[PDB]
DNA sequence: CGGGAAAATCTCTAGCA
DNA sequence: ACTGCTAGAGATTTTCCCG
DNA sequence: CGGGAAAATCTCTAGCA
DNA sequence: ACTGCTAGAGATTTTCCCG
């Protein structure tokens, strides 16, 4: 195919044909044509077609600012549950964001906050507030709103609800608080058929309960399991299978070839 | 070693090739000219 | 003693996602919880899921409806 | 199923509530609730207390969840009805508030607060509060130097009180206690919903007279008749709505 | 449920709860809660989640204008094949669009053109050109780019190719013509593994060939089929089934209960 | 008869109810106040 | 006479879509062509498809490769 | 399969080309092509003609596809190399142009046209053209009154010539004829590609000596050996690459 | 009838004012 | 009474090749 | 074991600077 | 070395109800 390879390369240096065109027109194997395309710097103009997945630990909160009727609304969401908080703030300053986050931390167990690189979220005042409250700040990839999709979606949802209750309030702060109330306690759905408040209560209570229960189980049930190795710690034996943890690797093995001491 | 061709941030023009320093699920860390950058895997191609 | 706690921890339900599947998988059975990983039992399949990808609830509506 | 009679014996002797019976004997909550409701020998989460504190010439509105002692306190620009209504609306949007107790002040009586409570479905009624309001002042005195403005110090004190102070029987914090209490109330509400849904049915078994349905299992039907609980096969019972 | 219905209606007039919330909180059947939500005018804020499908007859062309480096490019696409034409025009006027469409009609069999409501496409000159050339103009729903998705996508594609060949030309018109060449003959894919030019040639030739072949078949094969009715025209008998056309309704019937005369 | 709630054209606010005059695959024709309009089925809801 | 023309018209391939399915279905066998509708034979299933939703080709690459 | 010998008999007597044999006897095109290529007794679509026409003080560049007589004509502002190169690039992007014949004019010889032809892969060589160029002028005279400018009249005449004038053996139009011719050339190119791909293989059957592969069917393998075509079972033959 | 390799198909995303 | 699509990058499923 | 009806799940889209 | 999501509208698949 060598001569065909030279003709294909010369043709691609002019037209930048895709691999199918050069495979058809020069009798090339598909791998050769794909290699010719992949060696061209001018043809790499597309990324892989997939999305990532945001973290969903019970302590993760996503914060954003939205705008409505010339007013600024600072909105935080609990990723696990969909529970929201929202405040109409006079300006997008570090002081207001720091106050909002400090008040949020004193009402729920906030561990990390996920925000974009807006000037209010990256101020030294917000940094000091997070340091005092023991909150870890996570700005992801700059100018990548998808990394905050949850809060972004909540923005949409929040504004939608405001459009339904704006006539019941005389001021936008009242309508925002009404919308927060309605989203948190008057809309049911999701994993458990819950509202956001019910779901967040379930998430936090489950976290503490399971942590204490597993602490008790590990304190009482102490065993060493040998499979195929060293003294791996027993995690869960049952249903003809043993889940163990050998060298920071939680692995599942069949009940066979496993001795428990 | 790998070659990375990426779209950095609100710039329609693609850069590259860059050395892949780290690969994760959903993003990568690239070094394009003594300039360490983090790019979503939606905006990158690794060869 | 231990068996009651193990049954209680198995009473919890887990929703999870895989590294490249965007849809949420149904309420698997919690078997073990750790700092970084959770061991679950979904449709006769024992899996290890990252803690970052797991929502662990109890579902109080179903608990009250046997 | 096999533990129903054991549950009745346990309640007759030890008088255990329905949750303990359901945990020990593995019964549906409706059956244990009806067992404990059949003993004539036998027979709060949604209430908050509001108050105002004056410190350094500024007004702090403090709401205390009394079942847990959970404090939510905000510095307000003026002691007016609008600020109180806004604070109450925020509180009701954050937590399931059903009742608030106030000291019949001018701000707590205004029509704006009444309208906010009516919209949010809150009932208004005119030493936990004092104790928590004094502890909050103590913490504010402790942490005043760490902040410039009073509002930041107040929120820092609220954070410390809710999550950094622990005590009681189990050594939990106010946040932990309030999540436990609210979860218990959610369970209570779901059980009440299940009982209300089930109560509109009647069962004919073996046919005998009309009977009260308790549980509709996969391969069994637990009913009550003549103050006695019996389980009958699904095919042997007919359920109608009346 | 009547009392529960009044309480649910009063609660929804304030919070506008979704059907699940009112079903849970008022012991309502799901249909009753759904009816309560569906009777509220303030809750109808979402359309059905589907897309339409554009026409794909061999005579359909989609025209649009795109902009690049301050220049205007008029781009037409053949929907069936993906074959494109593109011209750099001095201005977005009715004269230029009419000239472009008249030249396109004289090179391919253009039957209908699908454009948006831009001032150049809705001018009286373009209307007169289409009337003379026997072209039917189809503006769809105003401000609905999805109805022209094909041409819109081609815009993207065209610009992409231009970005690869802009360095080989000194003027944008040359680069545009190079991009048209590359798309039409140097990129293979789609249904038949074709290029756009090969595919359009196949589409047009197949159209004429099948039309003449079916004309001959209908001229020679004349039959009347009675099924279950009147004298339905026979369309295709074979494989234990008969396709017929009874009263402008082409229907498939089993070979049984069908007599051919 | 049907009720149609629609979003007409680059206007985020939803209108309705309108009478459904015609239904097709992908679009509908509505009469909202002696004003016949054509709306994509993506931007309409029929009850 | 007629059989040759019928075989020839059956030699054509049709790609089509359904009213609510956005993906294109494979190369069905053309059986009949009309002004508005096309009758095709896809995987032992005889269907009537709108002409607006059908791309009819011959595929000259496959015809030359038996 | 059964018609191979009948195909050889038909070509020996009637001398039919491979397309007719493949149509009548249902053979893969490679087998019929090799049958007609084995008869030593036995043994254009991509060419265009360019010209310029001066009318009413303006220049019209006319390209004629001679296999069909298909006209593509545009009024150009000036008879320069840049305009000719732009016209050729448009023509090559619209149709598969491989050769253009020009009358060695100043514009057709310029380096810009040479560069455009080199980029587009067009070969340049220095009574169809005259006949079509006179018919175009006749149609322009007919339709001049229907338009104000000359370019619009020229495009109207091109439309009428390509699609509204019919003639020849089958009564087709120039557009119809050019699509037929280009489709036939696509078929020719695909058959040539298939033959080129297949020719790099050798087959051992029944083992006999090396043989030329023709067709690789689902349950048969058609090969040639000693100027005779034979079909052998797939399991009975081994195919290698040399 | 069966693994390894290759071809084919499925899934999914950006960009198109 | 009109209507999202298209080309490429991985990932997974199907087919082929010679035992 | 089986139709009709209802509940549950799947598919998919706009909007979020 | 970090990462689209969410709630609602139809459409289709599963389960239940009483013979
Ligand atoms: C100056 C700060 C810091 C740097 O970036 C800018 C610009 N920006 C743009 C969007 C936005 O594009 N929303 C539409 C959207 C699109 C896709 C998606 F997945 C999610 C979406 F919400 C925001 O929401 C947002 O907060 C910002 C912002 O805050 N800033
Ligand atoms: C003044 C004329 C007449 C009336 O409408 C405006 C505005 N407009 C807007 C887009 C546009 O939104 N492209 C992005 C896009 C979004 C979604 C999708 F499915 C396809 C897409 F291309 C166009 O392409 C376009 O030609 C116009 C236009 O021409 N006009
Ligand atoms: Mg945002
Ligand atoms: Mg456009
Ligand atoms: Zn290239
Ligand atoms: Zn409503």
Residue numbers in the entry:
A (entry chain A), E (entry chain G): 1 to 228, 236 to 268
B (entry chain D), F (entry chain J): 222 to 268
C (entry chain C), G (entry chain I): 212 to 277
D (entry chain B), H (entry chain H): 2 to 44, 57 to 139, 149 to 228, 235 to 270
Quote the authors verbatim.
HIV-1 and other retroviruses integrate a DNA copy of their viral RNA genome into the genome of the host cell, a process that is mediated by the virally encoded enzyme integrase (IN). Because integration is an essential step in viral replication, intasomes are targeted by an important class of antiretroviral drugs, the IN strand transfer inhibitors (INSTIs). INSTIs work by chelating the two Mg2+ ions, blocking the active site and inhibiting the strand transfer activity of IN.
The Q148K mutation can adapt distinct configurations in the active site because the Lys side chain is flexible and dynamic, and the exact configuration of the Lys side chain is strongly affected by the neighboring residues. By itself, Q148K points toward the backbone residues 139 to 141 and induces multiple, presumably deleterious, changes to the local structure. For a resistant virus to be selected by a drug, the gain from the development of resistance must be greater than the loss incurred by the reduction in replicative capacity.
